[PDB]
Symmetry: C3
Subunit: 545 residues, 3 copies
């Protein structure tokens, strides 16, 4: 119902006139054939209604082809405009490329808000199905993406920012879609996209086959060089393997991503790897892979991020229901240091031998982390213990456990190896907070720790029994409950020593009701005994009172 030689011209009349909605009909009213468009520019929120369907087939409703050498089909842009376009989009339309190897894009959207593409299809072209730049508050749900992309293509791209880092893709919904038989990133972002608040939820993703342009490089279904707040949840992912068009992993996150990215509750089938996280804050939990026909269990994320990641296992069940990869078996009470709070920015780095492969690097004269003491432990009658797994970068790293600026205990850290460092807190020393600091001259790598109440404390002390005549005895200095535990001692172990105590009868005498004691050592040999021991030790048990 508009004037011009071709559909490209017919439609441009509507735009110049500036009509709000432009209904388009099926393949019947153009006799079996799809209206062809090319390089059309739309500078206002125009709706393009259809009478077509989400689907592959081109024989039964609105269908659109790109023109033989066109760069794009539509480009919904607000560039140079004085009022940002806000609305419209594609509804009920089977969009298509000119050839199966055509490059460029199908839809561009630039300098836009509240774009929507419902119940459509994007297919057959080796470039990008949808290219977004400075597109906000939009929605792309209920579409098909098929035979898109390749070395210079993909499904949906979040492109560079337009001018400021804040001129980005944000508040975008990608829901209820189906992606199959594609190449490149199926959803992706550039090194300068800065995207934020993205929902990728309740989609199907499945290999199906290699399209016209196979992948040339190792590829990822979801490939985001940058990504801030994102929900990637309740999706299916099916048959992504290296041999099936080089999908080496499901998700890759780039080194300058911020997060928080939530990769949760996805149900995978015969996928080779969760993928690679090189940056950002990423939370992964509730993911399960049925290995199906795959020859190997799914691989877990490779993590090299400089920031906290919380990556629970993707469970691997074989097709017969047998678990072959379960939850990670953590040390009881283990906490990775990056989960704790602290006053200094400390980048995480990779160490193959860390419990999670992710460890903090803490310079000289710097806090590691600080935490609050549980209220139940703060009763003046609780002994606590810190075990921290650490590795010196070089000689001379020292870890101190402190209550604010008060120093409770220090340990020298061995260079080049992971070792466990134990610090006790006496009951009379525990306050509101504890911290670990590097008080040495070299970097220390800090893996994680175990903090909690203990029902004992180990105690070692100086003795000097010397040379004892037949039947003579030596009594050790008094071991006060104050110095031993900082609170009442319930009882002690048999004492042991820094050497043999051959021919000494040993017992323990209480010196108060509160479990203070001496050790008595008596020459039971019947002739002169030259002793050699200089240290005595017990395990001291604590209860309450």
């Amino acid at each position: 119902s508009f004037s011009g030689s071709t559909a490209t011209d017919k439609l441009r009349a509507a735009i110049t006139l500036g009509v709000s909605e432009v209904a388009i009909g099926p393949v019947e009213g153009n006799g079996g054939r799809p209206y062809e468009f090319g390089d059309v520019v739309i500078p206002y929120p125009l709706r393009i209604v259809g009478c077509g369907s989400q689907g592959i087939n081109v024989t039964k409703g609105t269908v659109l082809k790109r023109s033989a050498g066109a760069s794009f089909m539509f480009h919904f842009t607000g560039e140079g405009q004085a009022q940002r376009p806000m609305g419209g989009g594609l509804f009920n339309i089977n969009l298509n490329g000119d050839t199966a190897t055509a490059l460029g894009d199908i839809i561009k959207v630039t300098q836009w808000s509240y774009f929507k593409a419902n119940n459509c299809a994007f297919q057959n072209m080796a470039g990008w199905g949808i290219r977004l730049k400075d597109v906000m508050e939009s929605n792309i749900s209920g579409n098909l993406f098929r035979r898109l992309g390749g070395p210079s293509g993909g499904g949906i791209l979040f492109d560079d920012v337009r001018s400021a880092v804040t001129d980005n893709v944000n508040n975008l919904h990608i829901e209820d879609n189906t992606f199959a038989l594609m190449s490149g990133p199926w959803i992706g972002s550039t090194a300068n996209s800065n995207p934020d608040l993205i929902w990728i939820v309740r989609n199907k993703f499945e290999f199906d086959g290699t399209p016209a342009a196979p992948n040339t490089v190792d590829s990822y279904v979801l490939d985001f060089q940058q990504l801030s707040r994102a929900f990637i949840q309740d999706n299916g992912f099916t048959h992504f393997t290296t041999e099936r068009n080089r999908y080496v992993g499901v998700l890759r996150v780039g080194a300058t991503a911020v997060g928080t990215i939530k990769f949760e509750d996805n149900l995978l089938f015969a996928c080779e790897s969760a993928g690679l996280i090189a940056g950002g804050i990423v939370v992964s939990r509730g993911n399960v892979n049925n290995q199906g026909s795959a020859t190997t269990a799914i691989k877990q994320f490779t993590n090299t991020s400089s920031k906290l990641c919380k990556l629970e296992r993707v469970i691997n069940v074989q097709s017969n229901g047998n678990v072959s990869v379960g939850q990670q078996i953590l040390p009881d009470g283990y906490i990775n240091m990056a989960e704790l709070p602290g006053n200094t920015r400390l980048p995480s780095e990779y160490d193959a031998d860390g419990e999670t492969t992710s460890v903090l690097r803490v310079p000289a004269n710097t806090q590691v982390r600080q935490w609050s003491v549980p209220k139940m432990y703060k009763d003046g009658l609780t002994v606590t213990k810190v075990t921290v797994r650490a590795k010196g970068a070089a000689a001379g790293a020292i870890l101190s456990l402190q209550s604010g600026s008060t120093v409770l205990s220090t340990k020298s850290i061995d260079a080049g190896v992971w070792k466990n460092y134990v610090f006790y807190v006496k009951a009379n020393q525990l306050q509101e907070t504890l911290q670990l600091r590097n008080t040495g001259t070299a970097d220390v790598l800090a893996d994680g720790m175990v903090f909690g109440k203990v029902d004992y404390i180990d105690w070692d002390f100086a003795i000097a029994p010397g040379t004892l005549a037949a039947g003579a005895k030596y009594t050790t200095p008094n071991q006060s409950y104050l110095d031993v535990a900082g609170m009442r001692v319930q009882a002690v172990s048999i004492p042991m020593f820094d050497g043999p105590t051959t021919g000494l009868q040993v017992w323990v005498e209480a010196t108060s009701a509160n479990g203070s004691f001496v050790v008595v050592m008596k020459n039971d040999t019947g002739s002169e005994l030259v002793t050699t021991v200089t240290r005595c030790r017990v395990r001291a048990f604590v209860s309450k009172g």
Copy 2:
């Protein structure tokens, strides 16, 4: 295509005629200007289709203004009707108020079911965008809400019930929307709303700026005086602070709310507080705040509810990726008493010094809580231990640990202070269930507990060694494994005493294979020894067999 002076009159003709769908056109067919409506009443399910968009702008599709002094624009009601209206609503329409300070509402819906408002906009007015009363099975997804509300306004209100408490808002979806630049409650409910089964999922909420009518009182984005079953999940919330139009918190729940409310997996940016929960059952987990430009870490929920809340921390990450607020460090094995089952309704109350600030008040002669014993522990060879954190309201509270009506152990509770109370269960005493009861005369406040297996038990017993001649010895009464642990004893600690044992040689003699024993005390001084001790104690170790 209907007869009358103004649009208000034109449209009423359609309603009197009772047409099912009333299509409305863009700003082109009314020459740049939006059809104005006022006080229209709709008593049947009428659809009002449009050719407009979710968006701010008013220059490119269906657009509607309210008339200069109208109370409402539309009021979809079934009041006085004999068949409840079931269907219709607003589609593809940019709805608007007459002025930026106009009060009243834009849409009222009353005595209704299956109302829907898709792909529209609600904006520029200081009253309520949508006011719902007795509205069931409805859906409001894919809309914009902007420059709404103020002291007497807001986005969506769930109003009082119509007649019975069951004449309420229920089974309502609020999804895929965008809320920005508003005042009052952005979604809210009255003290008599009684709402149930509400989805507020995958929305954006962002400050953006102060509208025409700033807030006059401390405000909350989500403000629900009443709320039963609710999903508040997978939302963005951005820049809600006191200085930015007095958003002191994200969520407030009123004292008479029932729950269960799920506040989960929301991604916050530069928000000041999660808010305030004064009632209901509320579950919060998986929430994370990037502090961004905010000068302070987000504050956690303030909880004063009389009912169980499970509030995991909102994690605070700084813009550089550093955790400054992590997961709460709980005592190992801690369980808040309100998570346990029990036969008596026990209101929770606030105590700043409780592990979660929430504690039970248990009157005289009342059960605290009862739990099932794990099957693995019920082998006749397991010693268990209960530590419970408690505070007397006044003198004379007593806690008893029981197996049904059998009393295992009692402790007097100190008034006015939090203390840890330890109860052992001997291996021959453990059955199907345990309970803690107040068997005293005053209220006890119960914080939480730690229940589990132990590998030792502490034992204290009467002795009377008296006055021993040179070389004489005293042997304690037999300490049976039955009385000590209720099962085989593996071994014991060195014995300790209620006073000094100067000059006594002490050893232990087994009296059976099953670890029953006596303690032997021999005068090693060579003259008369007057002993002073009256009690002996050990830690007894248990294994199996």
Copy 3:
């Protein structure tokens, strides 16, 4: 606008002509009455737009009745076709049966893809509302289902596969719907459906009442004989009880289901039982039932599946906010064996006395499970311990703990009873992995285990003190720290024995700094002492160094 006697004929003209969209009008243009259809066949993706609503009422928009003896109303099929139909469906239509007891179906869909049914209603008939066979990539959201089904009926059925097991229902969305007042399965699947990637999310389900055809057998709201990947999340379920039309449970999963099924974050009101799981991998968490007016707390799932299930409690809160059923109290560190990985398929089976009622059956000469040792424990200075709960099927089952093919410890398993079996790993024995194997001649049932670090090890050794003269002494053989713990010993308990040690003074002499020791036993009686003991034992304490 098509030629024929009745609507059945009028519509068939459109299909023969092969029109893409067939708009249908309201009850006004057919004078109060609904267009009646019967046995219509649709072999191409045809859209059927309406001007009606999701709703019960039939007086205000597009409404359709089935013809008096019709088997179906529509049957969207691609049977015999050469291009699979891909698209179209029902939009804005109040579909209905001829009578309230009519059997058969309302909609059939067969050999189809990308079917959609938005904003409609399915009601009043005793057969199936929607019957799906080989239907892929479809969507059924925003509908009502009411007064459907009975002994031969229900809401949505996933029928048998068409030819191959891969010709099934898959990638189907069921969202935003309302189900009420129905009989049979409200959503269901056959013994040969093989469905995969099904979303049942954010629906209301509520009893409301018994329809025309009550249930004849014990019924389930969700009844899936087969089901692979499924999201069943964020739903309401209300008043499903035996007395309210025999809804004995919410979910039943059949014996040949594969999973993974996620039953998570559903909010129940006055429901009697979560239901019955007889197969598949099923994950249940975050579900809560407000008991409301029900006389009993909800019952938990009954589990008889041959595969791993992770079933966290459905929490039961009474209407006053009191927990009456809380989280399951598990033994600390408990892991069900089916959560661990292993090299052999081991079917799970029911045992009422297992911690989760689900236990593995492990034949003779077979691995139970194998796990990785935490990195923090692999420092050559950590003693670990395995406690496993086991029951012999018959005499002669044996459990071995191994490091690969090296055997660390073996225990004989008692027939017919559950007992706890303890295995220590010395510090010098711990490598990369541990495994438990059945090395006996009978089946063993394996419930679960507790694995972790310990700070002690128990040690028992041969002694032969014989007959001692007055004042004579016996010294035990040396107890090396290598044999005791495999690492330095900190200290030991008082020694105990396999019998009485009447008249023996006992002490301990260190034989090295590393906690190796002998026990000294001296005749303190003053005449000949015939000893009877042959074994000595200690608890040995370990720290580090």
